[PDB]
């Protein structure tokens, strides 16, 4: 993955550290299961605590909403 | 047209138009309403021989 | 060749003795325009500043 | 306790003859003026008193 998707080596090192810690534990599979959520909980679920700018798409939900009909409008500057 | 001026980076003037600082008018003082004080200049001649 | 040095020297002497100071930033402040390059057309203010 | 711009549109240029007015003019030459009559000011009165 690092060579194909151009991943940052710093993050790959952390992933390797997690794998090694899992190996050095009593049960590899159990360890992985219990620790599967470090990356999400620390990057995705804690993102943009202080926001400066960017774009957010402007979408509209039409009727009937049962039809799942959405139409794209444009970008809205963030704040 | 929209790929012209429309952009995210905002200068100070547009910020002021959208958000101007609110002056803080009401402030309270609990001390003494004064601005002059009396200071000693030369210590009094005490004790003295008289 | 003969006439150039006196003109140049007198120009420097005036520049180093007059109280006048030349500050081109006055034009920029007066224009007070926030230029940005992504414009196919040019506003007159940016044109004159350039 | 202000951080943004104040009086800066007036600091451009000479402040010794400031005045506030606005006008607009039709094609046929008629012009309409608006001259806001300046109200009082507690700060100016108090500083003159002091």
What DSSP assignment string belongs to B1-50? Answer: -TTSS--S---HHHHHHH-PPPP-------S---------SS----S---
How many Å apart are CA B41 and CA B14, to the nearest integer? 56
Structure tokens at D7: 């009086």
How many Å apart are CA B8 and CA A79, to the nearest integer? 9
The residue count of chain C comes to 50
In chain D, the residue whose alpha carbon lies closest to the alpha carbon of B16 is: D4
Please indicate if any CB of chain B lies within 8 Å of the CB of A74: yes
Q: Nearest-5° angle of CA D4, CA D19, CA D43?
A: 60
A78/B2 touch (CB, cutoff 8 Å), yes or no: no
C38/B7 touch (CB, cutoff 8 Å), yes or no: yes
Method: cryo-EM
Number of B:C CB contacts under 8 A?
Answer: 10
How many Å apart are CA C9 and CA C16, to the nearest integer? 11
Distances (CA, A) of C27 to A18, B12, C39, D13, D34: 60, 19, 22, 11, 29
Interface of B with A (CB under 8 A): 2, 7-10
């Amino acid at each position: 993955l690092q060579q194909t998707a151009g991943l940052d080596p710093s993050l790959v090192k952390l992933g390797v550290q997690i794998c090694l810690h899992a190996a050095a534990s009593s049960s590899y599979a159990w360890f992985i299961l219990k620790t599967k959520s470090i990356f999400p909980q620390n990057t995705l679920h804690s993102m943009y605590e202080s926001l400066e700018g960017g774009y957010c798409p402007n979408l509209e939900w039409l009727e009937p909403r049962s039809d799942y009909k959405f139409m794209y409008m444009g970008v809205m500057p963030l704040s | 047209p929209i790929v012209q001026v429309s952009a995210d980076v905002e200068n100070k003037k547009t910020a002021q138009l959208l958000h101007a600082d609110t002056p803080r008018l009401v402030t309270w003082d609990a001390g003494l309403c004064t601005s002059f004080k009396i200071v000693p200049i030369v210590p009094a001649q005490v004790p003295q021989d008289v | 060749t003969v006439i150039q040095p006196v003109l140049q020297d007198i120009s420097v002497l005036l520049q180093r003795i007059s109280p006048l100071q030349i500050d081109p930033t006055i034009i920029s402040n007066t224009m007070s325009t926030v230029s940005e390059s992504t414009t196919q057309t040019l506003s007159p203010a940016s044109s004159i500043l350039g | 306790d202000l951080s943004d711009m104040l009086l800066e549109p007036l600091l451009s240029g000479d402040p010794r003859m400031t005045q506030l007015a606005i006008q607009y003019q039709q094609y046929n030459g008629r012009t309409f003026n608006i001259i806001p009559e300046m109200p009082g000011s507690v700060i100016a009165d108090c500083v003159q008193l002091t």
